[PDB]
Structures are given as C-alpha cells and as structure tokens.
Design a protein around this nucleic acid. Sequence first.
DNA 1: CTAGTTGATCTCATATCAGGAGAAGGAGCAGAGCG
Lengths: 1096, 365, 250
Amino acid sequence: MSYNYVVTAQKPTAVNGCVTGHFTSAEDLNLLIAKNTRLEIYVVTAEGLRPVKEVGMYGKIAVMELFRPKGESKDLLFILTAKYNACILEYKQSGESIDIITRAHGNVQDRIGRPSETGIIGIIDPECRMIGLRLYDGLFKVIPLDRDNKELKAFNIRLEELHVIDVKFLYGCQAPTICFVYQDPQGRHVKTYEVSLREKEFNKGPWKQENVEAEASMVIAVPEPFGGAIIIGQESITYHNGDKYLAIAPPIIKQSTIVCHNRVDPNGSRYLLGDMEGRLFMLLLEKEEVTLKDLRVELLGETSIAECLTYLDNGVVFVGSRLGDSQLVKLNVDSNEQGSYVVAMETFTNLGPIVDMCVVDLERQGQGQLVTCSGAFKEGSLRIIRNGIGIHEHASIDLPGIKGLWPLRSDPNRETDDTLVLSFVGQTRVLMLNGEEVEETELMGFVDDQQTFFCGNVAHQQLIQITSASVRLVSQEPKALVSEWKEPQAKNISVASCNSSQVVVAVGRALYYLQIHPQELRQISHTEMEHEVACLDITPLGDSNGLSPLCAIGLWTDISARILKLPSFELLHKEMLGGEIIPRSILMTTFESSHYLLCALGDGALFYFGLNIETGLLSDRKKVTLGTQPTVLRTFRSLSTTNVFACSDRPTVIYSSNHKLVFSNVNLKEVNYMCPLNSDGYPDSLALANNSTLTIGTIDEIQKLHIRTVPLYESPRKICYQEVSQCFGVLSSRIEVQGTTALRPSASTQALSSSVSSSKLFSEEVEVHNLLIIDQHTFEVLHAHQFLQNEYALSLVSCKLGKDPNTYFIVGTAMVYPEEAEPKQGRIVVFQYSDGKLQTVAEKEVKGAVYSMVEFNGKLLASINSTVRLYEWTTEKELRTECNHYNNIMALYLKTKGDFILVGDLMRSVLLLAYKPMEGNFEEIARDFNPNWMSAVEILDDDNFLGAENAFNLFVCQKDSDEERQHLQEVGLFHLGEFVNVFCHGSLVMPTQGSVLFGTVNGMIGLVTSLSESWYNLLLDMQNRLNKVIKSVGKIEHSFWRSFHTERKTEPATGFIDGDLIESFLDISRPKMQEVVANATADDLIKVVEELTRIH
Amino acid sequence: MLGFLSARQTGLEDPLRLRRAESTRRVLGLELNKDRDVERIHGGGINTLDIEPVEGRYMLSGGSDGVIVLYDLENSSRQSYYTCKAVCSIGRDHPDVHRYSVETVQWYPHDTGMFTSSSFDKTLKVWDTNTLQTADVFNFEETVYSHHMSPVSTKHCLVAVGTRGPKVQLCDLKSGSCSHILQGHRQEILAVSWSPRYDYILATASADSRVKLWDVRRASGCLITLDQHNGKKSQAVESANTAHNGKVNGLCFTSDGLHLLTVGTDNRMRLWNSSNGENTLVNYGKVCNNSKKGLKFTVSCGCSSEFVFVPYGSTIAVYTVYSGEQITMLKGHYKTVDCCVFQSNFQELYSGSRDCNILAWVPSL
Amino acid sequence: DAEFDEGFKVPGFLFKKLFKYQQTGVRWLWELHCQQAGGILGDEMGLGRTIQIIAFLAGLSYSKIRRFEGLGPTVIVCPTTVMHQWVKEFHTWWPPFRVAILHETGSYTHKKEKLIRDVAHCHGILITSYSYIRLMQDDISRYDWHYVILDEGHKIRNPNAAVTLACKQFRTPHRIILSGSPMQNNLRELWSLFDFIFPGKLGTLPVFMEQFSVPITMGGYSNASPVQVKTAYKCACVLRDTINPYLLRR
DNA sequence: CTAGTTGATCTCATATCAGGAGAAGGAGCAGAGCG
C-alpha cells in the first residue's frame, strides 16, 4: 500500500461561476463566486468587494444559483456538485459567528445516464416552485420546493429531445414553463414545456417549437414586462414571446461566439454578453407601450475572457474568468476616446489553466520557485510563485516621491527614535510621529532648504544631518548647530556615508574623512581616487571600541567594489565586477559569523563576501540576481540579529538561517527606501516608502505566496529552464486570422530578435507557434523563433545530449492540417541559444506528432503518435534512432527515473518501460490494465507511479511485490476534483519523503508527498475523527467526496490523506479537538499538524 | 485532434468532451484487427458472447457444440500481437457440459465469480467460475432460446428465461424458485432483456411479432405492448400491436435504458420509447436477419453518439441509434454472424459467427 | 400521523388504536399496493386480522394516492355470516366510507345492478358474499374495481369451483385474501389461493403439482425414503421462499 | 309490508396342432445413369 499526503499549496483561482443576490442579509448585495471547490462570499460595497466568508465545498460546484422562496427573508443558495450533491444553503450570522446551514441536501446522481454533452445545467423557477436540473441526455430532473423537503427528493420527466443545448425557466407564466434549444437532425429548434409537479410530466408549452439559427447556444429568459426568451446564436440574436419574433444579426458579434450573459436591470432592458475573445457587449431591449420593439447590440469594450459575468451596481461589473484574471470593471456612460466604456477597477489573480510549470532555484537560493504557463489565448502569461513574508500597513501618509528615511530620537532621554526625517528634492521634511499620530513638526538644527543624503543619531548625545551642501552636527538637548564642516571648494557632496561615531563623505573623485567630537567636527584623512565615488559604507560592526576600522568603495569606469583601510584611505583590495553599470549601493554587515560585504549593480545582481577584520581582502565571490531596478540596502536589527533589507521592484529581506544566506521575498508591490523604527507606539517596526506614500509596518513569520505576472498575450504551452543560458524556453501559440495577421501584439511579436523556421522537410483563423527565449532575471522575451506554417509545437525539453557539452532547446512539433484527425507529419528540432540567437542545430522529420520528449540518460526519448522511440545524439550532431516501442494507443506523457520510463497513455493509462542498456531495446515491465484517460503522470519512488485521470482523480500504481507480475497494482485512489495538467518534483520551502507539485486547470497548485506507514495510520485515524466532528457545508461526506469516481467505476479513497482536512485540525476550538483526540494528548497532534503544514 | 488535447489542457472543453468524442472516433474506425486473435476452441458456431461487466477482462462464449469457453481479453504478453487465450472451458469431457447448443451465457452482474448459461438441452445452469462446477440447474420443459439477468438488480436476482413455451420463466437464484411465469405471449419467446434502468422492468420478444414490457413485481400482466404504428391501425388488442411483421428475435435497451431496439424477421429494426413503448420512427433502412433463434446484438456505451452493432448476415452493421445513419458494415466473417458484444473500455467489438470464429474489431490507429 | 414510503399517511389516532403487529400489517399491505401485487393475510384467527384492512384502506383513502384519486370502488367478498359484522367494523373504525351490502337482506331494496353501478360510480365499499359473486360474474366484472378483498378466502381453495373462477375474473392487481388457514388439505389449495392473489407466481396448476405437491407430500409419509424426505425438505423451503412476501402469517 | 317456514335447487366438500388366399410394406440388393 502507498501512503501519500495531498495538500493544496494554492487554492483554485479560476472562477467557474458567480451569482449576485441578497444572501448574507436582505439589504446586503452579495457576490457569490464559485472557484472550483471554494465558495467565496463578498459584500458589494460602494467600492470593490469586502470578503465575508470563504467556505470549502466537498465538491466541484457545478451549479450555483440564489433563490428566495415565499416568506423567506433572504436568498437561499442552491449548489449542485459535479458528483451531483445537491444542497440548499442559508447564511446565518450570529454576531461574530458565521455559519452556512444546510436547509436541505441530497444526491441526485442517476445510477445510469448519458451525462449531457453541454454539461450540467441547473435552473430555478423564477417563482421558486422547483429546481430543474438537466444532468443526462433525455431526462430532466425536477426538485420540488413547494413540497418543502430536507432530502431534496427529485423526479425525472422524460424529455422527448435528447440533445438539449440550453434551457431556462420563462417569466410571467402561471405554470413553471421551460424554454430550451435542442438539436435534432433537421436543425436546431427552440421548444417550450410546462412542468406539472402534480402530474410529474410535461405539457404543451405556451408557444410551439420554432426553427432557430444553426448555432443557437444560449437562452435568456426575459423578465415579466416582455416575457419570452432571447436565443443567442453565432450570427443572430432572436427574441421569442410566442407571436413576436424579433431577429437581428449584428455584424459585430459574428467574429466570436457569445458564451456568458447577465441581466443588468431587473426588467431586462439591458444585458451584458461576454464572448470568447473577451469583448463585452450590451444587448438593449427597446420597449414600446408593454411589448418589445427592437434589439440592439453595442460593443462596450474588452475585458478578460469571461466565463461568467455579473452586474453588481453603479456600473461595476465582475468579470469572472477561468482563462485569465477575474476582473472588476466599471462601465462608463461615455467612451474612453478608444471606443471602450469598460475600465478595469480591480484584478483578482488567476493562475489560469496551468498547462505546464517548472521549479527553478532562481536567485541561487535554497528555495524552489514555480514558473508556470498560466492562462490562455489573450490572457496567457508566465506566473512566478514563491513563498513570501508579509507585514501590516499601520501608519500611512501619502507624500509623493520620498527620497529619504531616518530614525531620530528627538526626545534625548529615550533610546527610541521618535522622529522621522525625509528628503524629497532639495529640502528636509520631518515627522513627529508622536504616538501613532503622524504630523510634520520641525526640530531645530536641520534645514528646510537643502536635500539630505543622511541624518541620524550620533554619539556625545548629538544628532547629525548630511545635506547636499555641507554637514551639520546638532547638539540634541541645548540648541541648534555648534559644529559645521563644509567642502573648501563648496562642492556639493555627491556620495555620503555615516555611522554613530565618524563620517565619510565623497566629493566627486576625492574623499574626505571626518570624525565627530562633542560640539566639534574634525577632519583627518583625504584621498584622490582615479574616478568618481559610487557608494560607501563605514558601518562599525562588532566595534567594541567606538569606531569602525574599514570602508568600501565603488568607482565609475573601473567598476569595482574596492576596500579601504579607514585611517589611511589606502587600497586594501581592488576587485572588478564587469558591466557598464555603476554600483548604486554597497553595505557591509554581520550575519551571525563575521563581516560580509553586499555590493550590487543597477540590475539586481548582488555579491556577498567574507570580509576579514585584519586584511579586509575580498574573496568568496558569489553572485545572486534580485530584481531589475537599481537597489539599496539598509539593515534593521531584529530580536535575533541583523536582517538586511533590499529595496526595489521586488523588496527582499536578506538574512542567514543556520549559517546559510537566505533571500526571502516580501509581499509588497514596491519599496523605494526603508528605515528601522522602534517608537513607543511602534516596536521594532519598518518604515517602507514607495513613490506615492510612506508605508509602515512590522514583520510577519507567516508566508503568503507571491505571484508575479509576465503578460505574454498569447497562449503559453510548455516551459523549460536552461540554467547554463539563464533563460526559459516557452512554447507559445498565437491566433492569426487572414496571408495572416496578428489580432494583437503578442510577446512573440515583441521580442528583441526573431526568426522563422526555414525547413526543407515539408513542402478563418490559424495558430502560429513560436519558441520564446525569456530572460530569467527580467522575464523579457530575448528571442522568438516562429515555427513552420501549420506547425504545432507540442513538446519542449532543455537538455544536453550524447557527449557534446552544449545545452539544447529541443522542440517536438507536428504538422496540423484540417484534412486529418491525427497529424501524420512532424519533426524534432534542436536549437541552441547562444549570443542572443537561436540557431537550428539539427532537425529530424518524424512521421507523427511528438507529444512528449524527456531526456533519458544522455539520450532523447520522444513519443511520436503511438510509438515511444529513443534517439541518440551522434558525434555529427543529428538524432539517430536506437529503439522503438509500439504497444500504445497514444504515448502522451513520458517520465524517467534511471533506466525506467513511465508512459501515460491517452486511455491505457500507464506503462512501466525499461531501457535494458545491455541489449539496446525497451522492455514492457508492468502495465495498468484499467482504462484511465491520463492527464499527467509522475514517478514518486522506484516503484510508485502517480497518475491523474481526466475524471479529476489521482491514482498511484505500484509494480506488484509470473505473467501477472506485468500488472501494475493501483494501490492509491483519490478524487482530487481538479484536472491535473502537470506534475513536477520540487518544493517551495527550504516526516514526509519527496515532494511533487502539480498544477491544474482551475489554478490549484497541490503537493503530493510520501508518508511512512505509522504516520499514515495516525493521520487516517484523525481523518476519520475530523469527519466525525467537522461538518461540511452541504452535509457531504468526505469519504464520498474523495472516493475515486469515473463514469464506469467508483471506489473509496485509499492510500491518500486529504492534507486539507488534516490541516483543518488547527482551525477548531479545543473542545472539538478533544472530541477528535479521545482515544495521545492533543498537543502532540497540534505539533504533528504544524510539522505537516511545514511542507508548503 | 491536437485541438482536443489543447482544449482539454486549457479547460476550454470539459474532459468529458475528449473522452466521448474520441470514443466515438474510435468506434467509427473499427476494423478487423489481424493484430489480434481469439483462440479457436469451438467446434461449432458461436451463439453468444459476454464480456464481464466489471473490469471487462474476461469473455464467455457459448458454442453450438455445447461448450462454454472462457477467454482472457488482456494482452498479458509484451508483444503488440496477441491471441486472447482461453482460460477455462466447459469442454466435451466436463461432467456438466451442455448436451446441445449453448444459446446464452451471461456473467452474473456485480461479480465475476458466477455465470449462467442456458442451452437447447432445456437447462439453465449456474456456474461457479472459480471451481467451474455447476451450483444450480434449472430444468425447463422446453428449449431455452435466451435468458438474462438484470444488470442493475442489487435487490432481486431473477433470471428471465425464454423457451419455446409461450411463457416467460423467472428463476430466482436466491432460493431457487423457478415457478414464476409471465403469461401473455402466444409463441416462443426469442429474446428477453431486463431494463438497465429499472430494477424490475423486463422486455420479452416473441415469434408472434409482439414485444411486451413487464413489471415482474406487478401481478397484472404486461405494462406495454409495442405497436409499429402507435395507433394508426388500432384494434381491440387480440392480434394487433405487433412490433414487427415477422418474428421479433432480438432486444437491446440502449445504454441509458430510455429506448428499446427490436430486430425482427421482417428485416427491420425499430427504436421504441421504453417508457410508453411508442415508436420513434427511426428508419435504419433494411436490416437482414433471418435467424430462427435469438439474435444477440449490442449498443455502444460512453461515446458522443450511441451506436448499435447488429449482425447483418455475415457482417456487423453499425448504425447510429438516434438517427439511423448506417456508419459502416464490418466485413470479416465467412458465415452468418450470430452475436456481437461490445467492450466499453476500449471501444472494441467481438463477434462470434457460425464459422466457429470470434473476430475482434478494434479501432484503427 | 404515521408515514410510510411514498405518500402513505394513516391517521395517527387510527394508528395508535392498532397493535404493533397490525401496524406491520398495514405497512405490508401498502408495500404490496406499491408492487401492485396481492397477498394473503394469514394471521391466526382472533388476532384482529380484519382491523388491519380497515386501517390500510382508511389510510389509502386519506392519503389520496394517485385513474383513481385515492381509493376507488372496492368489493369485499365474505362469508354470509359476517357481512353485517364487516359493515359494523367499517362504520366504527372509519365512518367516512360508504359500505353497501349486496344481499337479500341488504339495505337497498331495488334492483341490485343499480347498487353495483352506484358503488362503482360513487366509489363505495361493496360487501358481498361468495354466492352473489358466483351468480353475477357478469354484472360485477364490468366496473374496474380497485380492491377485491376476500374474507375467509379459503373458500376459493378449489380451483375449479364456480366461485373460484368467478373470483378470478376480477382484473385489478389488488387482490387480498384474509384466511386464517390458507391451506387445509393439500397444496392444491395453496396454489389456488395464490393464483387468485398473484396469478403467475406459482406456475400453472399442473406444474405446481408436479414440482411441489408431489414431492412435498411424499416427504410426509412414514415409509418415504430419506432421499425423498430431503427432496420434500428442499421443495418446502423453496415454496416458503416463494410465498414469503405475499403471505403475512403471524 | 315482514319475518318465518318450506320446498326445490344449486354448489361444494369429503376418499384411496388339419386355413387359405390375396394384398401392402418393408428390406435387401442388382444395376443403371450420372455428376
């Protein structure tokens, strides 16, 4: 038996369904958003959305609709799960406590039935007399509501039409009357039936069947004033009320199909219509005195590709997208001078369809960092995910363009710095920051007329302020300046540096040493360098006498973070760096062990060193790239030790854990400057400035995933990391219409350089495919190689083959022509990225689609249509076949560990292949003979094979222990509820064995890891206890939810622990824990579950 | 297709689409696999085949020579070419072998450990698969043309048996009670079939050209008698309400159990609404059968479109159930085809025929 | 009230008057009604067997179960002695029903066929005797009866008596026999009773004799070989299993 | 009019050697076409 622990690293982000109504209260306007298993309840405030409750369903929310039965105060919620768990939910808030009580529930899955093509429809009678569910072909399930059930007893009415596209309940009808579009051989027609709950059968509808457009796919029930329905097809919008037949063919809706709609008004005079391109239309019903006069369609603008859209109020429209980020837009009354009325207010991150992903230890830390091909046609993008630190934004004040922050103890007695200084362009503005209050009040001795490069508290009970003109040492208690020094030529200081005792300030190409004496400023040392100063640091660290011994310098035109002996300004060391960019900050600090130096260039590169106190010679040069903006480094002292902060586009805390330098991310957008502050009202806090305002807060141990977004504007398909070249190779796909024309500027069309495939092998709208080389620091498209006409790039591996040392981008393609169902032609192209160009090093015409390539022990293992063959890289640099394997329907997925090859098939599901090198051929070791349609596969151990079937299930196969030894044994079964597109070894963090991430279509990132037998037994026990204690929203059983489910099989879960349910063991009060832990003590299990949460 | 893989991967289409559309595409590509064979063990024609409903690994096969062969359909060898080896066999030397032609053979639904087989020796024998010994024998006064166990009954374990007698016998495998009879037919019952949807609905077809659906719980005769015309030729029911203009020697509920396909010796197939037995007027053209005994035909399962595979003389004619369009005629047998059975996991068809062969039809590529 | 599976609600006061076994009976009778099968109430006499029918029919009418809107016209055939007893029983344990007596005594004092029509139209409960059933198979079997209870139904134990055939001309599936002893001399009597309630369960009479009566009988004789004893034992068990659902013998 | 009585009149239930002649069918078998 296998022992696996599944947990959610990132909850699903794709909005599969959204409704609005009065759910939390009769006066609240709620936005209920269904992300695959999460129901998110918001309150529609005058601005944005205020989250109120987020619950986890034990089901994929297939249907989600609000209805108000007679007498009810506020809307009840009907949810149907993909496994057909129906429930009616009511929201009951008792002060602080919030509950979602199940007013009714059931399971409406018919034992048998052909699940309808178009998918689970759930409608509710506008008068709440029944819930109509179309789940299967030829049947229409009715759940009465007037018969107030608690079990949702439902009955089928046999529907004489077997291919129903869409169906709605009509308005203003004495009987529940459905209107549906169905497809028969004679075309598509719209028909109506009246539902008799007493006779439990249909009756003749109000207006007979009508022959409608060929591609009619949408029915819109129109409220009572008009009644009738509006059927949207590809080329027409037609309105039916029984005798009235309005019909329009707005040319603007011909370009794309309309897939979602929403009624803006209560009276249906306006509808939103979202298309698969992301356009947003407004469908207007002009009334005449009431009947309907005419239909109009107007293009409001563009949004994200909407799966569902809901109109909230005051022009605010929530565009819920499965393919891109969900949106909160505004509809302006007037156009934007670009023809668009849509204006995005807010964007909700959606790791869209994660079609591929890789774990790269970027920034050369010990931390993994996901890079995912997220999104689709217009919403495609690369998302970079990492675990990141967060703080609270307590004290904000919006002063544009800060260029300075320093902590000052204006109260001389206290060692707390109760005053904050800021320089902006040419002056200094101070802040009292008294208490939590913040206002600008002036402390004597500092000038409001000059920029300030530095100020702070210094020894002898003195303050110091270094300006663009000259230095000012104020005596704190008595009065203003009694010591001033200025440059003899009165040249503005170009670079400064200072500590509590001494001062070091650069004047162009020469440097000046001053030291503080009480009510005096004494100059001692001077030097004339080759070129201008770039940055300094003189900080005394482990001082123990009163003065730092050493200094560091960066110079122009001789780029080098050099070292100086302080009393003499002499060269202790001179270490070059390279590049034409001046270093902009340099610092030395201690991390638990000794003095380090941290010098960075303007593009986020950063070198850490081991600095000696005697020689101060720079060695142990190693580099890390952090951000793209020039950087600055200021320390804050924590409880424990010095914790250096880096301020740029990606603010990063810098620190050492267990004598190992860590480069943590901070989850804030941008920080210009930082300074520690420990006020009476603020302990150990930070003071973080951006271009707009001064943000203030502390440091939080808890880590929140940080998601970067790189808009590609075209569907990414694959991604691999070539470390030697510092780039990502991404297979992208863009849709061109006409020869052809790009509908929008994609990332491929906007690369630095470009190329097109000129191959001698092969001689509406089309898909063009490119290979994008993307910089792994700036995530800019270094290069975009377009592939042949009608060539689909499917697979992409980065590797080095044979014995040559070059690392190659290897793309396996197929030639796609509409005249055929499976490509007959394709090729394996070998690229090399070097000198900013992508040369074609080799080619190989294969006779099928290359669905997958894995580098396999120095050799290329490709899977052409049904054959798995192994290629070798010859000294001539061409691919030469070594062995083939044919016993496959479609080798879609390939994995590797040693000599073993795991093949995920289109529908034979897994095959354990071995390359016996002694012979030079494959051997079918084991096979799983169950018909599972794979979506992805992975190798967990030498003998455990994770799989994902397209029915949202995970199974683990195991080579058993005669010819029954060629049978893989499915020892693990688990219903994930998500469609896995990719597995990958790795972890997002610095008890469990191994760690496999997976990315899904909904945007979930999960984590599978191996447990030991003892811990698995314990956790299974607690799983049962929590099931006995924790109560699910729709009263769904966890075991039923996690039971392996297929249309021709259903088994209980086994060998898999829902890490979500276990980790829920922390969010329950102590008495409930004791209920869990009846038969070791609780604190033991709290420790266990904490340690379990440590993995993600 | 690569559009289908990309659509599945990006969530544009439900994965159900790729499964069903690809399942259909596979059915349309059915071709005689000479890369697969079934071991020849019948000395006489194969009358019946049955792939087990759970795991679809094993097939039973009943011959005109009275032997029952038990095949393994999984390719346990590493080659791409394999012969479905015969695991067991109720051979000429088995003490319990049928004396005459085995006419029907059926896996017990819900479990592979027991199967049942009925013959022209007027017996329905229940077999323990493991020991391959009869656990029970029901004797009938008249030769058995077909029997059928409910694919759905978790509750009852009745076997409906059609003999040359005009009566339908229900044999309860739970304590053995072969007394219950359904009365109302007038000639031999050539085909019986339980509903896959309703636990106690049985459809029985007879040489008197009439098909009746029964609620065997009910004590009041047939629910429905299928009528070709639905009432255009309406008579006080004593001889009218014929499903066909010959003998009705075949029944098959569609997968979801909402429709009934009947084939009769008027060389027609009809599609009936199994709820009110109304004729859907699906054409299907001309379907040659002149079988004097039951004609075993199947439907597809889990495709975008349902198909029915009917023996058409020496070929298997494939039709679309709900439109009647003949997909193709699979031509690989040498004599008339008696039975075809559908493997729902991989869209494979096995057909036995009087030429002592069982041909596998697997999708091409 | 007391509630069973689909829509059967019997009034609570009526239910409380019943015993536990009588309540089980009412449930059993309704389950049969759901199957559309008949049964034998073979409770030993004195166990208030009649009260169970009253309760069940009352509950069925009260629940207004859906041709018929609840309880249609129904006929009770009982021995001549007990007709007014049944009338009395309906009248006390459920006044609402109209319980017409079909007899020379009777209460109608016109032609009887008018009374048959009246009950079949107004949906009463026509009590009658086995004789008037034998003598008006024509008139009575023209009115779509909903229930055909035979009290002391063993009188139908002769499959060839005229009264038996007349009783087996009724068409509805809801046939009930209330018979303290549904088998008195041999199983031929049993088959006859089952062929009224459930016309196919035990097969044809010849086949039933061949398969059940002969073996079961031969196992009772003193001189029967043990083999035949065991065949009898087998057949007897099969028979019990076959008749278990449809006979409620406490 | 209404019980009560009284015939019929039906139904249902109870049990173990010295004949002879001729005609019709069937079986064995020779042989002739003949495919």
